[PDB]
Write a protein that binds this ligand. Structure first.
Ligand SMILES: Nc1ncnc2c1ncn2[C@@H]1O[C@H](COP(=O)(O)OP(=O)(O)O)[C@@H](O)[C@H]1O
Ligand SMILES: Nc1ncnc2c1ncn2[C@@H]1O[C@H](COP(=O)(O)OP(=O)(O)O)[C@@H](O)[C@H]1O
Ligand SMILES: Nc1ncnc2c1ncn2[C@@H]1O[C@H](COP(=O)(O)OP(=O)(O)O)[C@@H](O)[C@H]1O
Ligand SMILES: Nc1ncnc2c1ncn2[C@@H]1O[C@H](COP(=O)(O)OP(=O)(O)O)[C@@H](O)[C@H]1O
Lengths: 154, 445, 442, 442, 437
């Protein structure tokens, strides 16, 4: 592909290689916008209002909304009552990365759906089994079409 | 304490006797004795909870009290019973179909009851002595939990060590631990430990140290609707979807599994089904698809009692081209029992206006009450009820406490009703913008 | 107990190799429609024919949906039954054709028989036995792990694989728990801690299950009943990708995607292949579409295409309109709102209206189902009510009659109470009468 | 499998002279339409002609869809046949032109040749070096037959395929190098040291002979749309099944066209064409007709088969009427095959073929009355009545189906004209087009 | 110099303390009855007692309805929230129209929270993290230094982790807020500028004030600010990301459960005396463009306990309701909804009050106009329309400027009248010509 990049080019023991690709389009912002509207400042109110909207008036805060947290801990079955406040105030992809959770209360309203039972069966299962081969057909289509050796077209 | 005075704030419930016989004026409801008795019969078959999926329709002219009787039924129903009052305009959504919107309303109006047994240990942590296992399995701990009254030392397993390390807890942090279920919380930092640290944390919260006994026992009753279980069991982290509203057309297998295991939960007795009332206000503002789904969706055992209100006469049904009684198809009126309301005479208007004056703290004189009664029977009840408050403000601007006839006359002069506005625009049609987009803006031709 | 204008319907009640009785199974009357539904039920149970459509034609409140419920109850609980309104096909997330096809797949059932040879019980010890000649540069060269399992009336010591120890430390298995290891896949499943080993008396959060019963080595045959639509929606979604977009989609909203025909074809192929081995059994199921006059012409064309297909089951349709315009077409007048080609495809079963004594027997049958006691004079008044007014109005008036009897402290329903309930709850027709009389927008 | 409405056609029933027999391959009559469909079949099988539209027309219940499925059965293996109806084009995430282009690129095929090595032998040892977190996986394999023993290095994907279907030493497995298949044919050592964890009972197999590596050449068929979705994004293979292929760009199409031309010129790939079948073509919009008009004239365009049962009617999206519901510029590019209604002999032969396929025995008089009923109202009505007459006969405990059984079936189940005559006599019973009805008896 | 918009000249209703209306005050002239009606309305809003009140203003175009809405807006003051709104804005393609109406309903209710802002400014002289394990630091002792002195602080692990996030070393000017905990690194100190002759470290001077600065503020938030604060389909609203998230969140239908929970939390904070509730005004201009479905939801939502005062304005006569076919109604308002409303009529004008309007807008925009030029502009305003005269004040000033004059004379007015045409003259030209003007 055409490298739409500006970078460190040579005009002509080791020679170190450092990633330096940049977009030639440069968007210029004044310092006034950044230092007045985005960063905290003594005459700014961004940190104060941000805390007041994210922590003080959060409905998942257990200090002031313990009944709702206990309600949702009955429903979901979380072992920790601060899981709801932590989940509501994390970036979603960071929530994806930090998701690995195995203990759950058995006296909860979270359920194991038939599809989830079948997924737990085909987490690890070999061939010649009916209950796994009826659900692993994407890999069967990948294997029978000789699709790991098709050349790139685009 | 957040709630203010509304148009329907005076109503505290149906004014019934023990024999389902309405008093002339009780609990803010005046007149409508046959309608209130029918609503009381509906209330009793709700409270019995043995009949599923009845449709009852409330019909009457405008400013009669169909909405008033519905929210009176809601007030007499009490808390811990689900009540869903939606308009017909809330059905039409972009990312959810209309049929799924009615299914969400139906399963939002029916719920189950769940009992808790809590043994909570709420106290400020003094010290967390860790007994480090050599192999690392089954780590032991010596928690120093302490309220204002007493202190003792507890024995901790490995997973509670993991819980107290996966959320950071230190000395002086107020927590509560349940013995039976093992639930861990972190209420914050005790107020006695506020001056140790000169600048607070981003997440650090200050809570009072608890009083009295360390270990407390309490039972809690929880009422969860079936729609909340539908939302929770649909997604991995589905409790956010209870609040953002992004549910996204929950499939039928999930609802079928939830229904069958709520049924066997009732069989083993952990839960008890609490039926409720769904109030579809302005049901004439619905498509024929909504009416057909309402007809076929009332024949399930997990269907609430549907109350609908209509002020429409023999008009067309939306989505078709033919006129039908009440703006509803004859299939819906087949599976319906109609509560019919009737207009009021001058005495019922006088008593309702007196009630709404006593609700908004407005002190009405007798002559002003009679003048408001005449304006109510001439134009409408709601115009007079809205005139009361502005008459109060006019009187207060005149440095007076009570309202006289002059404040009501000035309030009648400054603000116009529908009929005077209609005559005042029919007299001068040149100044207003017509249906054909023609207007005369020049004041002199 | 809760009644929802049904569950007096307990099967069709067809006599064996003969006609049906007049008053049986909670049904009164409709002899010919009951015979037709019995023939249809026997055809479904014969498990040969596919893509057969049945349309029920009748007036309002005549027992079409009761007949479909009786078909579903006669077929059994293992035979799937997917009731559906014509308004449920209109989806805003996905096109309507995909909604109809996934309902077709949902109506198909599959029963799978499998065997499981499993080991479970309380663990006594886990010793990672080191190997003789223990290589070089690595400590802990496991030759095998010995796991001692105990349960009720049995206790077995086991010689496992060197590799299963990684699962042992992956699921945090220690002495004092109950595990679950299968013979073929070789995976642990830590069910929880035993009740006897509740050593942390003061504060612990482990789940505690009772010690399992039977021998540790129990081999059993387990049946699983699953629809083909569950197989399609399990194959289509990412099955444990362990990548960023798979967990991204698992934590996000499950948006309904248009499933291609290719996945359906491979699912059908592998299902038929395991049918050939005999290890599965396919059970077709009846699909019920209510007020099919409400469907668009596009839905009827896809219904035609799906009916000519292979795997699609018997579909039962119902309509109350007699001569109406097909929706989506401007001037196509057809019987029952069904286009004449689809009308030619299906078989039509008509349902006659009832009589006075039939209405009376239906009213008293629902009275015994609602567990109310009614005087025969009030029963005759309700029969005359069901003749002069609609039947469902006489049916829905019974519960207010019961409430007005209970507020007068008598179990019997007596004529003044049903007169009071008539005065309290107007009819549809009398509401239309007061609608035409009143000139104040009523 | 199950039996469907078009299951009796097993080909098209023509000779090498393109002359149809009176009854062959499950098809009877329709001599001119059968000869024309055979001509179009041979024109597809030649393959050098592209983008020709063929429009099948006639009355309903004639055999247009039967002729189309007959062409499909005679089309042979490895040739695509995309059979969609008119209403699958309309979607919420795909444009009409894009859905049509996806259909066009599904209907055309690429046959790719590959070179594949076959390795089969007993496993001597397996050494797998996995990282601490299990991410990086590398190792060596030592497979062996009786003539020579070789050691291979393993990659990540082969080792991951080795973990599933757990391969002990002394297991005869078959390795396909290109497809990445691992096929444990059995176990050949039957070792005395047996692990108590493992439950496998794989059968004893003979030790393989001959050379270890065998070269074979294989051919597989993949459509243009599949390669388009594959090259469209990173996870295109999952979107092939879940259908989340949202509006593929034109750059992808241009590059895959150049690529498949390059693969054709190397001898690596071969392009075979296909038949795209649209059923109820009149359901399409006018913009669909314009795009079909300008997309039939492309190099990669299949032989579009088009079916309609409609006379001069309103073309959708327009305010006028056109013959067959298709505008004149699309009718210019299309050659029209016409079909004709049947006589009593052809209807009798159709019903005899249907009864012989449906495992139903009929008498002569029952067949004559079924022929008379079929020529009276419709062929599909009698073809449906064979099933219920069969079920009534097995409910009466007789093997054959008699005249009384089909008379009871005719009485029990209604057709179009009788249901019309029952609706028209009882117009107050059903809901009218103006929504007026009388549910009360009196 | 300040810009002048259409309604800059009006400052308020100009009413007396007794409720009577002065003839020429507040930027208004005439219209005494509607001004007194809106004064009674703003006294009702300042009473802070009732919910769900509605008022419709009826009158012709260019009669001063939006002027009255702006006069109400200034009369309430900046303390009371105000959400002016066009009726076309409700039709949205992301979320349904009724939910947008309810979002505006929550937007017209506001809070006041008193909070203090204490901050620490200066140079990092010392940074000693004390571990006190129990790998984990118990606390960090950081000393700051400015021109007026130095001060030592004791900080938790989370502020230390934020310090390591900002790459703060010894000698960097930082920013620490005590309540929130924000750590911002201004740059390296000025006394450490000659350690190298050239390096990337931005050298900011030492702060001239005290290290510790404390002041109090007031935070004006609305209820809707809170509901969009704790209902994020994708979370992480707190983290400053200059480049946005990879998935754009869509506006969603906020359920009644979150509204009830936010109401409960706000009531808990008010009962502690922390927060004060200020109900506001939702102004919907041109209500005649509202669909009937929005009218039905408005009929439902005017009965809530937390609904604000709703001001609607319309100019139509007997008009079909939008979304209907055969429902004629006054001002495009359906007759069920018009029972809840209080209609205040707005009158047209005559020549003299048009002249006082035109000289007020001449005085505010500081163009000097001659007297006979003013009489010509008043006569031309009576003939054509008012807003044509209002919009031709400024080209007369321009043509006076290009002739090096400061006073507008008659010749400028005729030149602007010849150059710029009204609607009637352009329509007259439109009708006679045949080839599309
Ligand atoms: N039975 C009643 N008792 C007291 N007030 C009533 C009653 N019925 C109606 N109202 C008054 O009518 C006003 C609203 O009536 P509403 O329920 O909107 O009439 P409708 O049901 O015809 O729309 C309220 O201000 C309320 O005070
Ligand atoms: N033959 C019958 N025997 C007993 N009850 C009947 C019969 N037909 C109808 N019903 C009852 O009448 C009520 C309404 O009938 P329904 O099935 O809703 O009419 P439709 O077939 O038009 O939907 C139901 O409660 C049903 O149980
Ligand atoms: N020549 C034929 N051979 C076999 N079956 C036929 C023939 N002609 C008609 N049929 C049958 O007639 C029915 C109608 O044909 P089809 O093309 O599917 O619908 P239509 O003719 O209404 O388009 C089909 O079920 C088909 O099996
Ligand atoms: N009574 C008044 N006094 C002063 N200016 C007025 C008065 N009424 C209207 N105006 C002026 O007329 C201009 C347009 O009025 P506007 O509110 O847009 O008319 P409408 O009520 O039709 O919306 C405004 O800029 C306003 O300054």
């Amino acid at each position: 592909p055409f490298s739409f990049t500006t970078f460190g080019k040579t005009t002509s023991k080791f020679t170190d290689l450092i990633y330096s690709s940049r977009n030639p389009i440069k968007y210029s912002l004044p310092r006034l916008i950044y230092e007045d509207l985005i960063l905290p400042n003594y005459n700014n109110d961004v940190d104060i209002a941000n805390k007041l909207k994210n922590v003080k008036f959060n409905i998942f805060n257990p200090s002031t909304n313990y009944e709702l947290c206990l309600f949702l801990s009955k429903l979901t079955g979380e072992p920790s009552l601060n899981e709801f406040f932590r989940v509501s105030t994390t970036p979603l992809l960071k929530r994806v990365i930090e998701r690995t959770n195995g203990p759950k209360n058995t006296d909860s309203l979270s359920f194991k759906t038939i599809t989830q039972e079948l997924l737990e069966v085909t987490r690890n299962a070999p061939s010649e089994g009916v209950m796994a081969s009826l659900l692993n057909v994407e890999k069967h289509a990948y294997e029978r079409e000789y699709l790991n050796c098709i050349q790139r077209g685009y | 304490s957040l709630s203010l005075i509304a148009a329907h704030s005076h109503i505290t419930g149906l004014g019934l006797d023990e024999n389902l016989q309405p008093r002339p004026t009780s609990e803010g409801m005046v007149g409508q004795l046959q309608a209130r008795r029918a609503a009381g019969v509906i209330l009793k078959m709700v409270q019995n909870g043995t009949i599923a999926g009845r449709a009852v329709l409330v019909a009457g002219p405008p400013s009669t009290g169909k909405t008033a009787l519905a929210m009176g039924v809601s007030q007499s129903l009490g808390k811990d019973v689900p009540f869903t009052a939606i308009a017909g305009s809330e059905i039409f959504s972009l990312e959810l179909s209309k049929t799924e919107a009615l299914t969400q309303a139906f399963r939002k109006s029916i719920g189950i009851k769940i009992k808790e047994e809590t043994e909570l240990i709420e106290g400020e942590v003094v010290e967390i002595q860790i007994d480090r296992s050599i192999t690392g399995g089954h780590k032991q701990g010596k928690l120093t939990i302490k309220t204002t009254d007493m202190e003792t030392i507890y024995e901790l397993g490995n997973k509670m060590i993991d819980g107290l390390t996966k959320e950071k807890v230190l000395a002086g942090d107020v927590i509560s631990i349940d013995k039976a279920s093992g639930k861990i919380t972190k209420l914050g930092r005790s107020f006695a430990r506020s001056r140790d640290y000169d600048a607070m944390g981003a997440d650090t919260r200050f809570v009072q140290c608890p009083e009295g006994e360390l270990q407390k026992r309490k039972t809690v009753v929880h009422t969860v609707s079936l729609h909340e279980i539908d939302v929770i069991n649909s997604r991995t982290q589905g409790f956010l979807a209870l609040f953002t509203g992004d549910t996204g057309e929950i499939r039928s297998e999930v609802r079928d599994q939830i229904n069958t295991k709520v049924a066997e939960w009732k069989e083993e007795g952990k839960a008890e089904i609490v039926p409720g009332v769904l109030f579809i206000d302005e049901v004439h503002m619905l498509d024929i698809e909504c009416f057909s789904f309402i007809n076929r969706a009332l024949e399930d055992e997990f269907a609430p009692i549907v109350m609908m209100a209509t002020n429409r006469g023999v008009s067309k049904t939306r989505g078709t081209n033919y006129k039908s009684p009440h703006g509803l198809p004859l299939d819906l009126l087949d599976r319906s029992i109609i509560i019919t309301t009737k207009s009021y005479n001058e005495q019922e208007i006088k008593t309702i206006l007196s009630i709404r004056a006593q609700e908004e703290e407005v002190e009405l004189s007798s002559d002003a009450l009679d003048l408001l009664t005449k304006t109510g029977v001439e134009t409408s009840l709601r115009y007079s009820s809205n005139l009361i408050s502005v008459a109060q403000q006019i009187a207060m601007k005149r440095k007076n406490n009570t309202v006289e006839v002059e404040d009501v006359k000035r309030a009648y002069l400054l603000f116009l009703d529908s009929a005077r506005s209609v005559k005042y625009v029919q007299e001068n049609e040149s100044q207003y913008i017509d249906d054909q987009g023609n207007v005369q803006i020049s004041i002199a031709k | 107990t809760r009644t929802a204008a049904h569950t007096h319907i307990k099967g069709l009640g067809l006599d064996e190799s003969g006609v049906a009785k007049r008053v049986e199974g909670g049904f009164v009357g409709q002899i010919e429609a009951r015979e037709a539904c019995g023939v249809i039920v026997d055809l479904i149970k014969a498990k040969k024919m596919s893509g057969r459509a049945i349309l029920l034609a009748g007036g309002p409140s005549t027992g079409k949906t009761a007949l479909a419920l009786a078909i579903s109850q006669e077929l059994g609980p293992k035979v799937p039954f997917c009731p559906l309104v014509g308004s449920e096909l209109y989806s805003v997330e996905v096109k309507k054709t995909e909604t109809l096809m996934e309902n077709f797949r949902r109506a198909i059932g599959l029963r799978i028989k499998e065997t499981k040879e499993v080991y479970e019980g309380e663990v006594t010890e886990l010793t990672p036995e080191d190997a003789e000649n223990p290589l070089g540069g690595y400590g802990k060269t496991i030759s095998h792990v010995i796991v001692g399992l105990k349960s009720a009336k049995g206790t077995k010591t086991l010689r496992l694989d060197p590799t299963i120890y990684e699962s042992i430390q992956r699921e945090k298995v220690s002495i004092g728990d109950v595990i679950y290891i299968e013979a073929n896949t070789g995976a642990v499943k830590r069910v929880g801690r035993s009740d006897a080993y509740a050593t942390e008396f003061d504060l612990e959060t482990e789940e505690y299950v009772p010690l399992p019963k039977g021998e540790v080595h129990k081999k059993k045959e387990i049946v699983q009943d699953v629809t083909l639509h569950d197989l399609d929606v399990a194959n289509a979604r990412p099955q444990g990708g362990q990548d960023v977009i798979s967990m991204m989609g698992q934590l996000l909203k499950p948006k309904k995607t248009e499933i291609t025909e290719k996945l359906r074809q491979e699912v059908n192929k592998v299902v038929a292949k395991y049918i050939d081995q005999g290890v599965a059994e396919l059970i077709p199921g009846v699909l019920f579409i209510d007020e099919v006059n409400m469907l668009d012409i596009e839905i009827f064309t896809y219904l035609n295409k799906a009916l000519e297909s292979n795997i699609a089951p018997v579909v039962v349709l119902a309509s109350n309109r007699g001569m109406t315009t097909v929706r989506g077409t401007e001037d196509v007048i057809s019987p029952h709102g069904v286009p004449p080609d689809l009308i030619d495809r299906l078989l039509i079963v008509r349902t006659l209206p009832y009589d006075k004594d039939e209405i009376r027997t239906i009213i008293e049958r629902r009275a015994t189902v609602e567990r109310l006691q009614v005087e025969s004079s009030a029963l005759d008044l309700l029969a005359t009510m069901g003749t002069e007014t609609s039947l469902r109005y006489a049916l829905q008036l019974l519960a207010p009659c019961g409430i007005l009897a209970q507020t007068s402290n008598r179990k019997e329903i007596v004529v003044n109470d049903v007169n009071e309930a008539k005065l309290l709850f107007l009819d549809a027709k009398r509401s239309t009468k007061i609608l035409e009389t009143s000139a104040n927008y009523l």
